[PDB]
Design an enzyme around this catalytic site. Structure first.
Site, PDB file in Angstrom:
ATOM      1  N   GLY A 198       0.764  -1.119   0.027  1.00  0.00           N
ATOM      2  CA  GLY A 198      -0.035  -0.106  -0.109  1.00  0.00           C
ATOM      3  C   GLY A 198       0.838   1.265  -0.141  1.00  0.00           C
ATOM      4  O   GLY A 198       2.192   1.261   0.157  1.00  0.00           O
ATOM      5  N   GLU A 199       0.083   2.467  -0.359  1.00  0.00           N
ATOM      6  CA  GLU A 199       0.901   3.625  -0.040  1.00  0.00           C
ATOM      7  C   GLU A 199       0.251   4.425   0.949  1.00  0.00           C
ATOM      8  O   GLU A 199      -0.948   4.623   1.281  1.00  0.00           O
ATOM      9  CB  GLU A 199       0.455   4.504  -1.106  1.00  0.00           C
ATOM     10  N   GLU A 213       5.399  -4.688  13.359  1.00  0.00           N
ATOM     11  CA  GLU A 213       4.769  -5.838  13.417  1.00  0.00           C
ATOM     12  C   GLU A 213       3.856  -6.028  12.139  1.00  0.00           C
ATOM     13  O   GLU A 213       3.172  -4.920  11.878  1.00  0.00           O
ATOM     14  CB  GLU A 213       3.642  -6.003  14.825  1.00  0.00           C
ATOM     15  N   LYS A 268      -8.740   5.597  10.964  1.00  0.00           N
ATOM     16  CA  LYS A 268      -9.510   5.377   9.862  1.00  0.00           C
ATOM     17  C   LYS A 268      -9.592   3.806   9.504  1.00  0.00           C
ATOM     18  O   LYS A 268      -8.384   3.235  10.097  1.00  0.00           O
ATOM     19  CB  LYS A 268      -9.128   6.126   8.329  1.00  0.00           C
ATOM     20  N   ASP A 323      -5.346  10.372  13.424  1.00  0.00           N
ATOM     21  CA  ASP A 323      -5.831  10.226  11.914  1.00  0.00           C
ATOM     22  C   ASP A 323      -6.217   8.693  11.892  1.00  0.00           C
ATOM     23  O   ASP A 323      -6.124   7.771  10.871  1.00  0.00           O
ATOM     24  CB  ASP A 323      -4.757  10.307  11.012  1.00  0.00           C
TER      25      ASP A 323
HETATM   26  C1  LIG Z   1      -1.643   1.212   7.930  1.00  0.00           C
HETATM   27  C2  LIG Z   1      -1.510   1.118   6.411  1.00  0.00           C
HETATM   28  C3  LIG Z   1      -1.955   2.304   5.708  1.00  0.00           C
HETATM   29  C4  LIG Z   1      -1.572   2.404   4.293  1.00  0.00           C
HETATM   30  C5  LIG Z   1      -1.029   1.235   3.627  1.00  0.00           C
HETATM   31  C6  LIG Z   1      -0.761   0.008   4.390  1.00  0.00           C
HETATM   32  C7  LIG Z   1      -0.698   0.072   5.767  1.00  0.00           C
HETATM   33  C8  LIG Z   1      -0.557  -1.108   6.452  1.00  0.00           C
HETATM   34  C9  LIG Z   1      -1.028  -2.407   6.248  1.00  0.00           C
HETATM   35  C10 LIG Z   1      -1.064  -3.467   6.864  1.00  0.00           C
HETATM   36  N1  LIG Z   1      -1.107  -4.725   6.665  1.00  0.00           N
HETATM   37  C11 LIG Z   1      -2.331  -5.011   5.846  1.00  0.00           C
HETATM   38  C12 LIG Z   1      -2.321  -5.416   4.461  1.00  0.00           C
HETATM   39  C13 LIG Z   1      -2.754  -4.983   3.455  1.00  0.00           C
HETATM   40  C14 LIG Z   1      -2.370  -5.667   2.085  1.00  0.00           C
HETATM   41  C15 LIG Z   1      -1.572  -6.624   1.992  1.00  0.00           C
HETATM   42  N2  LIG Z   1      -0.924  -7.249   3.119  1.00  0.00           N
HETATM   43  O1  LIG Z   1       0.044  -8.010   3.049  1.00  0.00           O
HETATM   44  C16 LIG Z   1      -1.278  -6.557   4.442  1.00  0.00           C
HETATM   45  N3  LIG Z   1       0.111  -3.424   7.867  1.00  0.00           N
HETATM   46  N4  LIG Z   1       0.595  -4.162   8.652  1.00  0.00           N
HETATM   47  C17 LIG Z   1       1.436  -3.806   9.818  1.00  0.00           C
HETATM   48  C18 LIG Z   1       1.412  -2.226   9.399  1.00  0.00           C
HETATM   49 BR1  LIG Z   1       2.111  -0.895  10.426  1.00  0.00          BR
HETATM   50  C19 LIG Z   1       0.517  -2.063   8.500  1.00  0.00           C
HETATM   51  N5  LIG Z   1       0.228  -0.851   7.632  1.00  0.00           N
END
Ligand SMILES: Cc1ccccc1-c1cc(NCc2ccc[n+]([O-])c2)n2ncc(Br)c2n1
Length: 287
Positions: free
Chosen positions: A11-12, A70, A118, A116
């Site tokens: 993700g971004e 984590e 969400k 923030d």
């Molecule tokens: C919080 C946040 C904002 C924007 C982008 C990512 C994140 C984001 C997303 C995840 N895991 C969810 C996920 C989603 C898609 C694929 N996989 O493998 C896992 N994580 N896990 C720990 C963090 Br700390 C984190 N931050």
């Protein structure tokens, strides 16, 4: 960074790309995020609680900053989208809310805010846990209007005191956000999906009534309050979040009080009668 192997972009984020990565040594799978700030972040390493995603380490090299966290497999945004047809069962909504309030109570007891919250930063695992990601980063780095990729930072969960220009808002801003998320899990639709600051404010007013000196002493003095705001009447919660029961509507109404000083705290919310029959169900996760 040479100690980590990036597995995939997940993700971004507000501050930079987020990757799923593997520690080339311990084999640990983590989330790696590319980002006064150093001291504040360094302090977050000790703010540990089971409902707060663990900040493992901070790496600052060549003037670049990386946070190692984590890893969790799914976010609440995706889980809600997947649960759209039938909705998340009330007992699971309740467990999630209860757990998130425990995370907030802990952080708030140390005077640390999220600012923030969400669905995209509420992360879930196969065991029925939910955790808050990115806690404390806002104070360390700020909350921009657009992310590093230019994506608009959502206003949907923003407390009214922030929108009205209060400079020294409090832990109550996180309770407001969480109330908005609670309503969204119940109804399967964002509560206040504003697409500009005034649309956000006017959506809040249409539902909760335009705030005034009666319900929020001092509101008319705030920096961005305008006497020319339209005056909308407050709606009944029975209309806003059907078919939530009276205990849930009572708690929601307290989490959405206009006056931040009177909005319920996370600690008080944990004692609310809505949680008398709380349990910890396990969600069906398809990874
Ligand atoms: C919080 C946040 C904002 C924007 C982008 C990512 C994140 C984001 C997303 C995840 N895991 C969810 C996920 C989603 C898609 C694929 N996989 O493998 C896992 N994580 N896990 C720990 C963090 Br700390 C984190 N931050």
């Amino acid at each position: 960074m040479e100690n980590f192997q990036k597995v995939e972009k997940i993700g971004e984020g507000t501050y930079g790309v987020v990757y799923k990565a593997r520690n080339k040594l311990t084999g640990e799978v983590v989330a790696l995020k590319k980002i006064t700030a150093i001291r504040e972040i360094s302090l977050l390493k000790e703010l540990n609680h089971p409902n707060i995603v663990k900040l493992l380490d901070v790496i600052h090299t060549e003037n670049k900053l990386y946070l190692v966290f984590e890893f969790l497999h799914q976010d609440l945004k995706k889980f809600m989208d997947a649960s759209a047809l039938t909705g998340i069962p009330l007992p699971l909504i309740k467990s999630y809310l209860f757990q998130l309030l425990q995370g907030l109570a802990f952080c708030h007891s140390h005077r640390v805010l999220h600012r923030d919250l969400k669905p995209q930063n509420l992360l879930i695992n196969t065991e029925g846990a939910i955790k808050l990601a990115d806690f404390g980063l806002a104070r360390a780095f700020g909350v921009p209007v657009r992310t590093y990729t230019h994506e608009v930072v959502t206003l949907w969960y923003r407390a009214p005191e922030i929108l009205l220009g209060c400079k020294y808002y409090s832990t109550a801003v996180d309770i407001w956000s969480l109330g908005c998320i609670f309503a969204e899990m119940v109804t399967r639709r964002a509560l206040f999906p504003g697409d500009s600051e005034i649309d956000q404010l006017f959506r809040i007013f249409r539902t909760l009534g335009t705030p005034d000196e009666v319900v929020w002493p001092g509101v008319t003095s705030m920096p961005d309050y305008k006497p020319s705001f339209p005056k909308w009447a407050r709606q009944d919660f029975s209309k806003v979040v059907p078919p939530l029961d009276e205990d849930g509507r009572s708690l929601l109404s307290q989490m959405l009080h206009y006056d931040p000083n009177k909005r319920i705290s996370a600690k008080a919310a944990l004692a609310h009668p809505f949680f008398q029959d709380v349990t910890k169900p396990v969600p069906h996760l398809r990874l």
